[PDB]
Design a protein around this nucleic acid. Structure first.
Lengths: 190, 169, 124, 136, 392
RNA sequence: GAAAUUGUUGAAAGGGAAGGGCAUUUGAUCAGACAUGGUGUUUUGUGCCCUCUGCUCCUUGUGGGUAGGGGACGCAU
RNA sequence: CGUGGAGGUCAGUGACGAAGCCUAGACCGUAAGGUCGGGUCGAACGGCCUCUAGUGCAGAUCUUGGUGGUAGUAGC
């Protein structure tokens, strides 16, 4: 954190047909120092963790694919691991994260995306939080002389939803989203 | 006598028989070799029969004869079989002696298969801790989509952006 | 393996004038009109079904990938396929829930049977 | 895009399906207040509204020279109702907080209703056209 | 009440003050009186385990590898109640070894590195100043607090490392002087070690050996998580063999009921859950809220069928089982949102609760209703019930 | 919540026709393995293997089931 | 081969979604037909062996309902 540049390691599913590699190639812009093995084969995740640590990977991103659309993103930093799932140097915004659980993911995307945060953004990556849904998209940032800033929507676009947050690599689950947990309606978390 | 019990099984129905879409019709009995109820594999009309079957242990060769035919609660005899594929096969064609060729030829096979099955299941026990299957009920879907749509709709999403930019100014 | 699988005629037969009318459907039916063109087989009209198209008893009923198809519900049912993994492949009748499919899946890979329609109702 | 948009709906109107149809179609894509300008100019017998569809008993008329047609008409009843629709659509728009200078009609639709009249169901989604839609 | 809870965030110890029936989830219910951090030494030094012999004296096990000692006194507040102040009288430091662990961090399936920390802290004997403090790494620091008011180190001893759990068998008496521990851990069968008050001498008197190969002719894993003793077994006491009974929980959900007089195998190893559900910790309760146990927790009676236990997963669940394994049922089922880190039956009639969820919870055993819920805003690994108090 | 039938948006052809048959073309478009082993050869633990010591049910036979102390054929490495 | 009900039988399937309907998805049948994948939906339903019928549609200036062209026409 604000010490060494995040040196990340992107990954993918095991087989991981086209669409995965596509969305990977849409990630490479918003992050950097981003490599990915581009091929993963059967190993046991302990190995990948170790070999990453020796290579000074702070954190790893795991894409998950249903062979058709990308689904879910695991973020592993030695530390917690998140499982999101999603449905479709710059600046950055966050919104409505105010909570412990919220400020956790806040600390995430404030660590990951900015790339030891940089500046001069005329294009901004906006993470907004509405109820139980993390969204972000990327605008381009144009002042209109009076007050309001006109924007272009330059893409891409998609929502996340947090599902897992668990302490170690795999270790214990410190939060869930049950199917029932929305039986109750107004909750809103983060 | 048995040929009648067959023909009854070949016109009326067995409790168990399948009739796959092509012309041929399985036999789902727990005890049989080959799993096709035809004259020579259907355990119900033989009166002399032998198969191989897993206990959750190793693979007991089950045998029957005419004499316990009337005493079902105990009819099938049973034998265990070694962990030496070689020695196994020798045990199998041992006990079966003048049992006709059918049951040596086939019983041996069922052994081979179940052994392989074991070995696979042993591999797969050790593999791919990752990405379990999961179902999603339909109303789970409907609920997620709508609630999301409303989520976005609620956030006009630029007012946040700009107001944050006036903030930064 | 298997022979090379030949259909002899791969195009579904349609009922005469199916498309020019909706009140007529697409399920083949004969033409009993003794004047009709399709009955007397004039050049350029649709092709009747007739026995000669009957396929090859060797490969008949074979799905393309080379197996046959056998239609299972619970695991106790696919255990009939312990013997034939080289001929039959088994798939999972539509009404099975998403609860039991995953069971037929796991157990169906252990046996090493090909399931034609996995990925039905199952995400990751 | 719904985020920047406004919807007006109307239903169970009693009109002619055909006239309402066309007089809806004529403005598809126009800017908001130029649209109102139009409907105004067309209700007072200035610039009539072209009918590309139902041409029987439609007198050749000059002003249709704008649209490529010699046929047009001054329907009374229709542009009233759609006029109001543009009104309330402007209301929904403003209380949304949208921008009337970008605001144009992105979608317009009419389609029939039960029954012997020919009542109608109308839909319009105005939206504020944004400069600079998409990079990539 | 008055309770203490270890705050993992700041490495402190909160004190909580309030009535039976408390909840913070709504403005309606009655409210906690007081919550306090104390002696917050940082993420390294967060409290691994805590023991209080008598109300003023409470010993710190501190993950820095440092044992401290805590003097407690009430004072005026700021209705009516009292609070306390917590300041450390004594310490003995750097008691760990990481590197020996780190050398085995590859073999285990767990995470990355393996921190050294205290897997046991407690008195011996039940009238005595002695404390047996255990480490992951196998190092046993046995330290009696001298009447000098100070803690003094009696010995450092070896174990076959790492050491996940360790237990002292007190069910006999205070007198007989020759102490039995049972400990275990990673791929490490349960082991009975014995120690004299010379406190330099540990011979391993007994060791279990695993059950036979499983259904697949594969080998069941070995990971004993927790062990609780019973009385020796009645009947004819038999040749050459120690008489003891004890029962242990494995990660792999195996309940394991050992009777030495029978032999080295467990005579019952029964999976409580489908497919290898990972468990943790343990508690022995009884049906009626009754107090059946020693002060360090070993259940007192000579027949397993009379046993009932509470065990946790790593996710949310907290379960109640019988000796046979038939599940009595979940606890806090509709409530607990997170990994439940710590559970301690208190007085047989209470249940301590706390974990990653950040709500400290207190449930009742027989009614199975949540009595108390407090939001500390922190992961909390440990809880001790101090004086149950009046409220003025 | 079907068809007929209609509106909108997009595709595509059309200016003299639509529809069908045999065949490719072009565009779009979709599917496209939890295949990831096998045969050995060696190192090494464990146990259903070895050697002691039992116990049990009955179709009493070229049979099952099961326990404890130890030691080095299946399994893991 | 298919439809409605019955006598067996699958210890069949099913709120983790039965039927039904849509389908520019796949496979099977020579064909009648069948079987799966998505989608919408909400509570029953299917395969084998046999019984029994109010059992199979393009037509009948067919019956009943819904729609159109005629056409915003002749017209008021």
């Amino acid at each position: 954190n604000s010490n060494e540049p995040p040196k990340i390691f992107l990954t993918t599913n095991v087989n991981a047909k086209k669409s995965a590699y596509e969305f990977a190639n849409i990630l490479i812009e918003i992050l950097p120092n981003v490599t990915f093995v581009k091929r993963k084969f059967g190993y046991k995740l302990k190995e990948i963790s170790d070999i990453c640590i020796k290579r000074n990977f702070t954190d790893i991103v795991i894409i998950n694919e249903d062979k058709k659309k990308v689904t879910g993103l695991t973020f592993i930093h030695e530390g917690p691991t998140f499982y999101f799932k999603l449905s479709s140097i710059p600046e950055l915004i966050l919104n409505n994260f105010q909570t412990r659980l919220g400020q956790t993911v806040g600390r995430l995307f404030q660590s990951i995306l900015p790339q030891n945060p940089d500046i001069e953004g005329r294009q901004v990556i906006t993470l907004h939080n509405q109820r139980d849904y993390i969204f972000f998209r990327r605008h381009r940032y144009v002042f209109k002389d009076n007050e309001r800033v006109g924007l272009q929507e330059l893409g891409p676009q998609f929502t996340l939803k947090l599902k897992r947050l668990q302490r170690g690599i795999k270790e214990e689950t410190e939060w869930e989203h049950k199917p029932e947990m929305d039986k109750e309606k107004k909750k809103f978390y983060l | 006598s048995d040929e009648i019990v067959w023909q009854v099984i070949n016109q009326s129905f067995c409790s168990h028989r399948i009739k796959a879409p092509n012309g041929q019709n399985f036999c789902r009995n727990e005890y049989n070799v080959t799993g096709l109820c035809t004259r020579q594999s259907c355990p119900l009309a033989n009166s002399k029969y032998a198969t191989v079957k897993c206990d959750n242990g190793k693979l007991y060769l089950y045998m029957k004869t005419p004499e316990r035919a009337h005493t079902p609660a105990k009819l099938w005899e049973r034998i265990k079989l070694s962990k030496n594929y070689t020695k196994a096969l020798q045990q199998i064609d041992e006990h079966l002696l003048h049992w006709s060729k059918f049951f040596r030829h086939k019983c041996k096979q069922r052994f081979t298969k179940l052994t392989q099955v074991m070995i696979t299941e042993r591999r797969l026990a050790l593999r791919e801790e990752e990405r379990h299957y999961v179902g999603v009920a339909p109303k789970v879907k409907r609920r997620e989509q709508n609630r999301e749509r409303k989520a976005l709709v609620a956030a006009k999403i630029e007012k946040a952006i700009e107001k944050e930019l006036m903030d930064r100014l | 393996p298997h022979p090379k699988i030949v259909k002899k005629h791969t195009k579904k037969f349609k009922r005469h004038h199916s498309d020019r009318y909706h009140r007529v459907a697409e399920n083949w039916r004969k033409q009993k009109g003794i004047d009709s063109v399709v009955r007397r087989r004039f050049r350029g009209n649709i092709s009747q079904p007739k026995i000669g198209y009957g396929s090859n008893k060797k490969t008949k009923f074979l799905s393309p990938s080379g197996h046959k198809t056998f239609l299972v519900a619970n695991v106790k049912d696919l255990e009939t396929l312990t013997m034939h993994t080289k001929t039959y492949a088994a798939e999972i009748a539509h009404n099975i829930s998403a609860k039991n499919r995953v069971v037929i899946l796991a157990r169906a890979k252990a046996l090493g049977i090909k399931v034609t329609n996995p990925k039905g109702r199952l995400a990751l | 895009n719904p985020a920047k948009s406004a919807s007006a709906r109307g239903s169970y109107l009693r009109v002619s399906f055909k006239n309402t149809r066309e007089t809806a179609q004529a403005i598809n894509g126009w800017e908001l207040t130029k649209a109102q300008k139009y409907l105004e100019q067309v209700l007072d017998h200035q610039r009539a509204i072209p009918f590309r569809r139902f041409n029987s008993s439609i007198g050749r008329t000059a002003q249709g020279k704008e649209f490529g047609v010699t046929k047009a008409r001054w329907p009374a009843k229709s542009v009233k109702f759609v006029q109001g629709l543009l009104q309330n659509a402007a209301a929904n728009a403003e209380a949304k907080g949208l921008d009337a200078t970008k605001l144009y009609v992105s979608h317009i639709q009419v389609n029939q209703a039960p029954k012997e009249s020919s009542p109608s169901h109308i839909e319009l989604v105005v939206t504020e056209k944004e400069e600079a839609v998409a990079k990539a | 009440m008055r309770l203490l809870v270890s705050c993992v965030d700041s490495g402190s110890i909160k004190e909580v003050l309030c009535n039976i029936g408390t909840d913070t989830s709504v403005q309606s219910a009655l409210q906690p009186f007081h919550v306090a951090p104390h002696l917050a030494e940082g993420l390294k030094a967060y409290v691994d385990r805590m023991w209080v012999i008598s109300e003023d004296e409470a010993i710190l096990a501190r993950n820095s590898g440092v044992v401290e000692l805590v003097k407690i006194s009430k004072h005026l507040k700021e209705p009516k109640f009292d609070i306390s102040e917590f300041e450390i009288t004594s310490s003995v430091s750097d008691l760990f070894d990481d590197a020996k662990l780190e050398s085995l961090s590859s073999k285990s399936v767990k995470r990355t590195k393996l921190v050294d920390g205290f897997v046991t802290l407690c008195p011996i004997k039940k009238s005595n100043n002695t404390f047996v403090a255990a480490t992951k790494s196998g190092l046993l620091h046995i330290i009696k607090k001298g009447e000098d008011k100070k803690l003094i180190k009696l010995a450092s001893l070896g174990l076959k490392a790492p050491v996940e759990f360790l237990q002292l068998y007190d069910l006999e008496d205070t007198d007989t002087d020759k102490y039995i521990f049972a400990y275990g851990g990673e791929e490490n069968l349960i082991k009975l070690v014995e120690i004299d008050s010379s406190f330099q001498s540990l011979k391993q008197i007994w060791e279990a050996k695993n059950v036979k190969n499983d259904r697949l002719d594969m080998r069941v894993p070995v990971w004993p998580m927790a062990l609780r003793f019973l009385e020796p077994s009645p009947g004819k006491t038999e040749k050459g063999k120690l008489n003891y009974q004890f029962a242990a929980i494995t990660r792999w959900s195996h309940l394991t009921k050992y009777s030495t007089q029978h032999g080295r195998k467990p005579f019952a190893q029964i999976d409580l859950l489908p497919n290898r559900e990972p468990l943790s910790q343990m508690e022995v309760f009884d049906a009626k809220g009754e107090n059946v146990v020693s002060s360090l927790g070993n259940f007192q009676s000579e027949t397993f069928n009379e046993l009932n236990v509470i065990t946790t997963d790593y996710k949310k669940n907290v379960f109640k089982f019988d000796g046979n394994g038939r599940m009595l049922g979940k606890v806090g089922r509709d409530d607990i949102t997170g990994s439940s880190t710590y559970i301690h039956v208190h007085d047989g009639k209470y249940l301590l609760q706390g974990g990653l969820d950040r709500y400290v919870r207190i449930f009742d055993i027989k009614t199975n209703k949540m009595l108390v819920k407090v939001y500390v805003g922190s992961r909390i690994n440990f809880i001790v019930m101090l004086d149950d108090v009046e409220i003025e």
